């Protein structure tokens, strides 16, 4: 976990390997690549209410908005299970208005 | 680890937050206390040194 203790970026594997008077080690490494710019906002207000991501990130690609997590990019539906909500939202920075899916009230029907 | 990808900074300190075990939520009610502290803490070790 330790970063560059042993390879340059995250490490995943090692494989070692003799020599005359030596070791030499063979390191596997994960590297992202190919990335993108997206809008994020830290907090969503719904209702009077502020939800937090649980293990991600929202982001926007303009006019709806997702929650990703933080290494890689697949956009997923809002919703009130991957999020947490914890008081009204009248002192954060950065709240921006939108609606929160759920899946039990049209499951009622 | 690789390219430099921009963020803003409150995001990097609540996932800093996170790293620790205390749950972003509480960073994010107490910017001005946390700002505040930060900068009378760098102020004194100025002073100090
Ligand atoms: C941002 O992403 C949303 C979600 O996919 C896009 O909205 C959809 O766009 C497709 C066209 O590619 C439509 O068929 C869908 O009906 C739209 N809505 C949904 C809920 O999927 C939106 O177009 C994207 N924004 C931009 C600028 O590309
Ligand atoms: C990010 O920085 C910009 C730059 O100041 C902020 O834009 C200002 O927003 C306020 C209210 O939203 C306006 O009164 C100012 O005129 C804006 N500034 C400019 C130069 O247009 C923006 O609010 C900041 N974002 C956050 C979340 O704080
Ligand atoms: C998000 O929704 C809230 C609540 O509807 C908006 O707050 C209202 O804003 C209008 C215009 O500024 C005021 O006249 C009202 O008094 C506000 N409160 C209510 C209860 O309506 C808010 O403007 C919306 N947008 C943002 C960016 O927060
Ligand atoms: C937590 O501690 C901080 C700082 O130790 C407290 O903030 C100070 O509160 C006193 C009490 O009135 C003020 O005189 C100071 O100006 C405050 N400092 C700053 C930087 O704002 C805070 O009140 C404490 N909170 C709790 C719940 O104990």
């Known amino acids: 976990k330790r970063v560059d203790f042993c390879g340059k970026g995250y490490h995943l594997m090692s494989f070692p390997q003799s020599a005359p008077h030596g070791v030499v080690f063979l390191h596997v490494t994960y590297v992202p690549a190919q990335e993108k710019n997206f809008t994020t906002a830290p907090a969503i207000c719904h209702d009077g209410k502020a939800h937090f991501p649980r293990e991600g990130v929202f982001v926007s690609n303009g006019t709806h908005w997702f929650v990703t997590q933080r290494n890689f990019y697949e956009p997923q539906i809002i919703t009130t299970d991957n999020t947490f909500v914890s008081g009204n939202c009248d002192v954060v920075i950065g709240i921006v208005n939108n609606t929160v899916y759920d899946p039990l009230q049209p499951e009622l029907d | ?49």
């Open chain 2, 1 to 49: 680890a690789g390219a430099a990808l921009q963020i803003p900074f409150a995001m990097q300190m609540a996932y800093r937050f996170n790293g620790i075990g205390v749950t972003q939520n509480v960073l994010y009610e107490n910017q001005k206390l946390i700002a505040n502290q930060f900068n009378s803490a760098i102020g004194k070790i100025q002073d100090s040194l």
